[PDB]
Amino acid sequence: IVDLEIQSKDKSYAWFLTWMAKHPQRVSRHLSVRTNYIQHDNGSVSTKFSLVP
Amino acid sequence: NLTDDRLNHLMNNMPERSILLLEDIDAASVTFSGLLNALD
């Protein structure tokens, strides 16, 4: 009645992760945090983040 | 314990708004060619 698939450590793995991340219908029940520094060119620099699933 | 791959990763994953410092670069597991390629 249902079908499945596995993949690990592969070219499509990171591609898949990025595709899941951008998608708006994500219902992610578990989250993480990725901190990164945002550079506003030479005008200013500040630190921000993204809640990766 | 330092290695060429470790060196490249360190110089590529430095925190932002930072200055690299190599005190006494004349001291020279790192390789000469690896260092040269890493710098330029």
CB B7: neighbour CB atoms within 10 A? 18
All residues at 6 or more sequence positions from A49 whose CB lies less than 8 Å from its CB, including other chains: A33, A34, A35, A36
Which chain B residues contact residue A37 at CB under 8 A?
16-17
Distance from CA of B17 to the nearest CA of A (A): 9
A51 Cβ partners below 8 Å, 6+ apart?
A31, A32, A33, A34
Is residue B34 exposed (0-12), middle (13-18) or buried (19+ Cβ within 10 Å)?
middle
d(CA B18, CA B39): 16
The alpha-carbon gap from A2 to the nearest alpha carbon of chain B, in Å, equals 43
Q: Does A45 touch chain B (CB under 8 A)?
A: yes
Give how far Cα B6 sits from Cα of B23, B31, B38, Å. Answer: 18, 12, 11
Resolution of the experimental model, in Å, one decimal: 2.7
Q: Scan for tokens 């260092």, then name that residue.
A: B35
